[PDB]
Design a protein around this nucleic acid. Structure first.
Lengths: 44, 142, 141, 48, 272, 235, 202
RNA sequence: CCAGCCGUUGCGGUAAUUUCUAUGCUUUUAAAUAUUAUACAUUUAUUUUAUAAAUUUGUUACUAUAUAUUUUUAGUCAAUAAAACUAAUAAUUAUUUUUAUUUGUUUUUAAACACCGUUUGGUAUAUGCAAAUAAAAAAUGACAUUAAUUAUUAAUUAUAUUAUUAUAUUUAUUCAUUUAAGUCAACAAUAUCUAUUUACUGUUUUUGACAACAUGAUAAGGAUUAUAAAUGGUAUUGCAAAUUUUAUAAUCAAAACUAAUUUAUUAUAUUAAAUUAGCAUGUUUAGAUAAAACAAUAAAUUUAGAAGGUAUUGUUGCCCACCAUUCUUUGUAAUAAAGACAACGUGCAGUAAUUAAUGUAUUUAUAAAAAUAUAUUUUUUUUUUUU
């Protein structure tokens, strides 16, 4: 057992240090960017 | 062991409250030999079939000078209860005999007959330490 | 090492307290046996409380209708013969097969020690206060 | 390191020391042992 | 308290005498203390700072046609990107000194020229020779920089040197492009570096970087040179080995409890 | 941490927690692990490990005939998927393109004067819109072959019978093929280190390749002798 | 160079400048005693001043592209054979059953398998995708930790079929692979995963 | 750890190069032993005498409306406002204070705060007496006969908000098992030129691995060196390689708990074959308390970088007084002083050390000491150059 207090969160390593940087946050919906730049180019 | 209750205390270590695999606990401690479940009184701690032949220890292989005690796996028969002669089973401290025979004993091995953990404990066999622990327990109060 | 320290001798003359105690205990072994064996047997001859749980279907249906019909007519004498123990009735009831598979799936049944209460067990205090002198494994009554 | 001797036929620290092969080296055959065919002994059995 | 006794072990056809006198101790207290390094034949020269001295005819011709040490170091390191080897800081560190052998000397010249106001006419053979003599001393390490400096400033320059300056120099300060002309001219005369422009450069390059800090030129005399720099160039304890590490000594099993290897990619990554 | 070379060079060291090369300090670059100018250093440019794993079967099923299985063991079994979906002619009934699809195309191809193109043939390219569609842009889609939606209990029968029939290879045949033979000896070497057994399994090859070539050659010298015009021996 | 402002990519560029110069050029540069440094440091001398798209590797015969996906380290492995169902009634199937039956008609899982198609702006009604359970085969794949392994397996599959679909996918992470691994068994922890035993002080 | 040793640090802890022995061995040859005599500084030194000095003097400040919780961490208690000016500071280093003068105790509360003390009572600050650190001295203790010293300061001792990055964070808890001894050496039978060798006999002197002491040696344990493949340690855990000098203790079938270092299965369905667990139903309810950040999903109530030790592998470190034997010794003050020394009991006074310490003064007392009053740092630091 520890028997010592629990350490803080920061001293613990990063909780998801394994998931790739691309996924946090997931830049979902890249499909729409081409739709949105068009309608935006429409109004402008 | 901390308290060598026999010659095999000096050698083997408690290894903590180790969890042996089922039915592979090393010492055959049949402290549950006599636990009377009346419905299963013929199936508990007996031959799983009632058409097996009796164990070897109930029989005599060759010309014996004499056994000091017959083993505890022996099964009690009417001949056992009726002949009445001294029938001994090994137990602590020295030996146990069936002086008062009955027919309620016929058919059950001697394991189920004797009481392994005798309720009357020995304030003499246990040092002041191990007795003290019984005092706290309430098994040997004061 | 906590160097293994000896336990002292077994004490003078305790052996006589052994051969005595083990013996006359094994004599007590008879009466507790004789008592519990009777308790088991005479339990088996008595009636039990009905094993089904009336709360769940198909035993919520009123006694007049529902599976109580077949309970009352097709197998009535039988369910009294089997003495309403929760082992035979659920086997007898499954044989009639006129209720389908709704014995196990739909019909919920009383817990074990709630189903070993004998008939006329009104007070619920009863199911826990069964005698302690008898060694039966809670089949007794 | 004790009274019980080290089995030289099964110990890596021995077999893979410098005084024998290492497991990395080409591991070929060191020297062919032509014993029975250069100076052969005749068959004098004890069992008649 | 029953102190243990350990018999000293004699030399042996397996035990060289210089091994056991080092690898063993009889005193039981001195057991289990720590790892005591000791260099050997070649890497010892770098910690001792001494090349192979002129032992014999072999060693001589070993040191004649050495060639451009400045480039060979840059080849030993740059080849860290071939398949055979990986880049090693110990090889890069070797470059820094091969380039900055003569920086201990180069730092001293940025001082004597660009920190000594009114050095006198450095066009003089007298003054210029004082430098070439002292430049012979900073390089080759005959004299520490601080002592070298106090020689140049208090070098025997001129009679009534204070008064002659009082005519050309009003506030004591003086011009550097006369000095730096002679300053850069020394390492032309003294064959310091194979690269000719290294001298003029590291002089000109150290100055311009120093020309930006506040109080650019004057230095606190405590820190004017290297001394006891200005013109310059949770799990962590118990998880010290698990990361990508280079095992200058490989840890055997008896040392590392459950460590298997540094190469081992414990938690993988899908590599196409 | 260790030089970037094909991993198979390294041998997991013993008692010394590092890596060591089974080549004695020599290192073969990735070039030697492939043919000349191989994309991503593959034996063949066309697919990866998995892409060469499953295209094997899809090509191996194209030739599966009831003979290919008999006598051969687990190898004789066809692609588990291509064969089990075939066994499912319940769903196999080829659902024709829906009334909507044939409409949305007919309106497109004729009414709106616009060709419709399948995604493979769609020039997703922004620059190279002159790169052609993949050479099979018109492959026929049916319900039987692709995908592999197969029957459950049969899928058991296949996967079980595959596990038991591993041993039932009859290799001593009278064929003329890369696995035709009268006697098939298999030698199983066993060394504690991978690079040991490999370098050994390389040795015995260039050994049996010698004795095997010679010994078989003498019988070939005998066979052509046992035939010719005034060469009788089969008399 | 001494101030160490370069990266690992430059060392490769300096190095390939050294191999590339002939020993004749060395003695042609060792004359200046500076000139060869200009070459061995060519790119870096100027660097002081100043998404992959692979070739599509499809089967030209069957039009099938194969991709691989792994999650939980190895406990899940699926590969996604993908072909263009021209009749617009293509389907995605898994282990001899439509995606519904394997994933038990669960939305939050069957939707993950859909992202790679919509993320690339494509329509799955054209595409016929089967997924093969290469990893440790389990009765029901009804867990996202398996779905992502399938979501990746389909993602890599489309790229092999279509080259420039890697751009919208890689920007959204469906191609990238997790390195998360559930802790392997260990006896010390009571449950075996991350919770140690008990210890009481005297 | 006793005998003993001793010039002297120190030795003796059942492997002493330190006692005792015997023997040898060493010496530079009038022997050892015990007692005496045998040369401060002066250029800078903290505890008790100075008297080469300008002093003493000084009348200003602040109080009425009701109506009714301030001050403290904390209960006591309880009208509440206030006391400011200027002396000078002008003539030689001198000439010998030594019984003289001098160093923060101070009438008046019909005046307050302050302070000790409670229902409040006090007392509340240089008119007497009162030399006293601020060179003048010779190893600590000590009344000037005791103990052999003492004192001392720079190594070492992890959290005090500085300009790529998160602890607040559930999931758990009643757990035990061991038996009834036995090592003192080797011996082809078939198919190879024949051995009865078939049935190869020669009478007996030791005490470590043990039931006992007997050197080594690898573990458990998280706390500040990965962004393009790693979260478990050396100081050590029973059986291991030089210390022996009572002694067989080893698994075999059928076998008895006292043990800190342990997931046990909680109400649709429940014992099939080597023998395997019947009393503990009571609101998944005391106090204690257990373990995660890893292929999953919690990313912030917040971080390097200044600091001390009487200890000296260091806070489970030492120390300190009263409280007993003693012994010694006196200048005999409740209940002599001093020094020695190891018990028990009482705290826990000191090392910034649980309200910082030291000093001095007053008072208080189980005892280290505590309160008030002044200096003070051998206490650690917090830092406006006219708003």
């Amino acid at each position: 057992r520890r028997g010592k207090p629990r350490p803080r969160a920061g001293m613990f390593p990063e909780k998801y240090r394994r998931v790739p940087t691309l996924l946090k946050p997931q830049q979902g919906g890249q499909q729409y960017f081409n739709e949105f730049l068009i309608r935006s180019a429409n109004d402008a | 062991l901390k308290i060598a209750k026999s010659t095999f205390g000096f050698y083997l270590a408690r290894r903590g409250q180790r969890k042996f695999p089922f039915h592979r606990r090393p010492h055959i401690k049949n402290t549950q030999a006599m636990n009377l479940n009346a419905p299963y009184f013929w199936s508990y701690m007996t031959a799983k079939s009632q058409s097996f032949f009796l164990p070897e220890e109930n029989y005599i292989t060759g010309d014996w000078t004499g056994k000091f005690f017959v083993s505890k796996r022996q099964v009690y028969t009417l001949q056992h209860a009726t002949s009445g002669g001294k029938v001994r089973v090994k137990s602590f401290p020295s030996v146990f005999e069936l002086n008062s025979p009955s027919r309620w004993n016929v058919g059950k091995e001697m394991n189920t007959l004797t009481k392994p953990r005798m309720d009357l404990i020995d304030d003499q066999m246990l040092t002041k330490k191990q007795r003290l622990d019984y005092v706290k327990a309430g098994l040997l109060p004061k | 090492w906590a160097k293994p320290k000896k336990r002292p001798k077994v004490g003078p003359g305790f052996h006589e307290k052994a051969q005595k105690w083990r013996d006359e205990y094994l004599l007590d072994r008879h009466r507790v046996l004789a008592d519990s064996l009777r308790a088991y047997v005479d339990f088996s001859s008595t009636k039990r409380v009905e094993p089904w749980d009336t709360r769940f279907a198909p035993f919520d249906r009123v006694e007049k209708d529902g599976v109580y019909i077949l309970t009352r007519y097709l197998m009535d004498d039988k369910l009294q013969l089997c003495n309403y123990h929760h082992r035979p009735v659920k086997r007898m009831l499954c044989n009639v097969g006129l209720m389908g598979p709704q014995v196990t799936t739909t019909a919920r049944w009383k817990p074990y020690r709630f189903a070993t209460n004998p008939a006329n067990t009104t007070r619920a205090e009863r199911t826990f206060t069964k005698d302690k002198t008898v060694f039966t494994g809670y089949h007794h009554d | 390191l004790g009274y019980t001797p080290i089995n030289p036929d099964t110990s890596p620290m021995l077999m893979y020391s410098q005084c024998h092969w290492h497991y990395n080296l080409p591991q070929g055959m060191e020297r062919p042992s032509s014993v029975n065919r250069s100076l052969p002994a005749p068959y004098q059995p004890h069992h008649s | 308290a029953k102190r243990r006794v350990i018999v000293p072990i004699q030399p042996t056809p397996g035990y060289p005498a210089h091994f056991i006198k080092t690898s063993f101790t009889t005193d039981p207290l001195k057991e289990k203390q720590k790892a005591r390094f000791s260099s050997g034949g070649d890497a010892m020269r770098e910690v001792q700072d001494i090349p192979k001295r002129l032992e014999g005819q072999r060693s001589r011709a070993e040191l004649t046609s050495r060639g451009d040490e400045d480039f060979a170091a840059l080849i030993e390191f740059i080849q860290g990107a071939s398949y055979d080897q990986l880049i090693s800081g110990r090889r890069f560190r070797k470059v820094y000194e091969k380039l900055s052998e003569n920086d201990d000397m180069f730092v001293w010249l940025c001082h004597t020229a660009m920190a000594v106001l009114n050095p006198g006419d450095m066009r003089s053979r007298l003054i210029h020779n004082h430098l070439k003599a002292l430049a012979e001393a900073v390089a080759s390490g005959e004299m520490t920089q601080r002592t070298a400096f106090r020689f140049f400033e208090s070098a025997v320059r001129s009679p009534a040197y204070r008064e002659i300056a009082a005519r050309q120099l009003e506030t004591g300060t003086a011009t550097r492009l006369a000095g730096l002309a002679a300053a850069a001219d020394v390492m032309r005369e003294m064959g310091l570096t194979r690269r000719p422009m290294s001298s003029y450069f590291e002089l000109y390059q150290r100055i311009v970087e120093r020309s930006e800090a506040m109080t650019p030129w004057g230095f606190p005399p405590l820190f004017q040179f290297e001394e006891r720099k200005f013109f310059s160039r949770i799990f962590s304890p118990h998880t010290i080995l698990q990361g990508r590490r280079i095992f200058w000594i490989p840890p055997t099993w008896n040392r590392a409890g459950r460590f298997i290897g540094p190469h081992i990619n414990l938690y993988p990554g899908l590599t196409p | 941490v260790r030089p970037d070379v094909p991993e198979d060079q390294y041998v997991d060291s013993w008692y010394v927690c590092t890596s060591m090369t089974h080549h004695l300090g020599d290192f073969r670059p990735w070039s030697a692990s492939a043919p000349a100018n191989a994309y991503r250093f593959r034996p063949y440019n066309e697919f990866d490990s998995k892409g060469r794993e499953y295209v094997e079967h899809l090509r191996k099923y194209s030739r599966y005939t009831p003979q290919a299985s008999r006598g051969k063991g687990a190898n004789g079994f066809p692609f588990r998927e291509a064969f089990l979906t075939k066994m499912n002619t319940a769903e196999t009934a080829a659902v024709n393109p829906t009334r909507e699809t044939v409409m949305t195309r007919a309106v497109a191809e004729r009414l709106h004067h616009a060709r419709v193109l399948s995604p493979l043939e769609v020039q997703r390219d922004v620059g190279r819109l002159e790169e052609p569609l993949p050479c099979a842009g018109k492959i026929p889609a049916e319900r039987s072959t692709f995908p592999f939606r197969w029957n459950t209990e049969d899928w058991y029968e296949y996967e079980v019978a595959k596990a038991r029939n591993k041993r039932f290879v009859f290799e001593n045949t009278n064929d003329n093929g890369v696995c035709a033979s009268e006697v098939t000896y298999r030698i199983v070497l066993e060394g504690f280190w991978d690079h040991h057994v490999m370098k050994l399994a390389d040795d015995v090859v260039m050994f049996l390749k010698d004795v095997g070539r010679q010994v078989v050659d003498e019988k070939l010298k005998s066979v052509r002798a046992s035939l010719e015009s005034l060469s009788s021996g089969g008399a | 160079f001494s101030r160490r402002k370069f990266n690992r990519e430059d060392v490769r560029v300096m190095f390939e400048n050294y191999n590339l110069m002939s020993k004749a050029t060395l003695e042609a540069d060792s004359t200046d005693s500076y000139s060869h440094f200009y070459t061995v440091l060519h790119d870096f001398s100027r660097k002081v001043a100043g998404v992959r798209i692979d070739p599509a590797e499809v089967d030209p015969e069957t039009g099938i592209a194969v991709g691989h996906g792994r999650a939980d380290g190895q406990k899940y492995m699926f590969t996604a054979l993908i072909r263009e169902n021209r009749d617009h009634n293509g389907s995605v199937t898994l282990l001899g059953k439509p995606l519904s039956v394997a994933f038990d008609d669960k939305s939050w899982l069957m939707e993950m398998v859909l992202m790679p198609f919509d993320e690339a702006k494509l329509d799955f009604r054209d595409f016929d995708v089967n997924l093969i359970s290469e990893g440790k085969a389990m009765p029901s794949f009804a867990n996202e930790i398996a779905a992502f392994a399938c979501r990746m397996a389909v993602a890599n599959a489309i790229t092999k079929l279509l080259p420039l679909a890697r751009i919208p996918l890689k920007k959204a992470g469906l191609l990238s692979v997790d390195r998360r691994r559930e802790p392997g068994q260990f006896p010390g922890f009571v449950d075996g995963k991350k919770n140690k035993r008990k210890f009481a002080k005297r």
